[PDB]
C-alpha cells in the first residue's frame, strides 16, 4: 500500500517506465494479483510525501 499522484497511477503495472517504475517500485513480468486505486484528496494534504 502507498500513496502516489494520479498521473503516476498508470505506472503500477508490469513493463512500465518512469520515476515510479525505475527508482521507486517495480513489479515482476509474471505478476499474479490485483491493483486497486482510489482518490484521497480530502484526507491527504501538506508536503509530507
Amino acid at each position: 500500500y502507498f500513496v502516489v499522484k494520479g498521473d503516476d497511477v498508470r505506472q503500477i503495472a508490469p513493463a512500465q517506465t518512469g520515476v515510479i517504475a525505475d527508482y521507486n517500485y517495480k513489479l515482476p513480468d509474471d505478476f499474479t494479483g490485483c491493483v486497486l486505486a482510489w482518490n484521497t484528496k480530502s484526507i491527504d494534504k501538506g508536503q509530507g510525501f
Binding site: 499522484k5 498521473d7 503516476d8 498508470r10 513493463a15 512500465q16 517506465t17 518512469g18 520515476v19
Partner: protein, 48 residues
Amino acid sequence: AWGRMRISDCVADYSVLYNSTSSFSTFKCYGVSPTKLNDLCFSSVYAD
C-alpha cells in the same frame, strides 16, 4: 494545420524529462516497448 519536424545527429535519453518537466497523462507506444527505448538506434525519426 499541424507541424512536422525531423531530428538527427543527436543522443536521446528520456531520463532528462524527469527533472522539472511536467508529468504525462498519456504515454502509449505501439511498435516498441517503453522499457527498450534506451538501448536502440533508429534510422529516422519524425515529430508531429
